[PDB]
Amino acid sequence: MESRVTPVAVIGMGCRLPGGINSPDKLWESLLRGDDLVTEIPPDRWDADDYYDPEPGVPGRSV
Amino acid sequence: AEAGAATVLAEVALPASIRFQQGAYRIHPALLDACFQSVGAGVQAGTATGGLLLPLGVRSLRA
């Protein structure tokens, strides 16, 4: 009543995230450690150097 | 270096509209011609004061 919607309780979660994070506790530990999960684009994905360009707005290339 | 400098250098890069073409050449023809255009600076701005010069080829090329 005080909440117009019936309150909902989260009873579990799952996650697979960069930097080897596959559990919420792993995410919490990484967050407390102040770790970063951003890295260079892996080559097997594609050639980052091929498409990289520091110049803004260059067609066909990313920044 | 000076008004009688025998060496010059220039910052050269393909235009954004063409920068993507670099993946299909050993040297992009436009970039190489731009490098040739750098010779137009010469020892002086008055180098070959009259008429237009055109390249006739080079002794050797080392990629």
Region label for A20, one of left (φ > 0), alpha (ψ between -120 and 50) or beta (otherwise): left
Between chain A and chain B, how many beta carbons pairs sit less than 8 Å apart?
16
Contact B4, B43 (CB under 8 A): yes
Q: Give yes or no for a contact between A27 and A17, defined as CB atoms under 8 angstroms apart.
A: yes
The radius of gyration of chain A's CA atoms, rounded to the nearest angstrom, is 20
For chain B, the farthest-separated pair of C-alpha atoms sits apart, in whole angstroms, at 39
How far apart are the C-alpha atoms of A14 and A19, rounded to whole Å? 15
Q: Residue with structure tokens 């707005």?
A: A57
- Of A42, A47, A15, the C-alpha closest to A28 is A15
Experimentally, the structure was elucidated by cryo-EM
Q: What's the resolution in A?
A: 3.9
Mutate to test the interface with A, among B20, B22, B28 (most CBs of A within 10 A): B20
- Burial of residue B59 (CB within 10 Å: 0-12, 13-18, 19+) is exposed
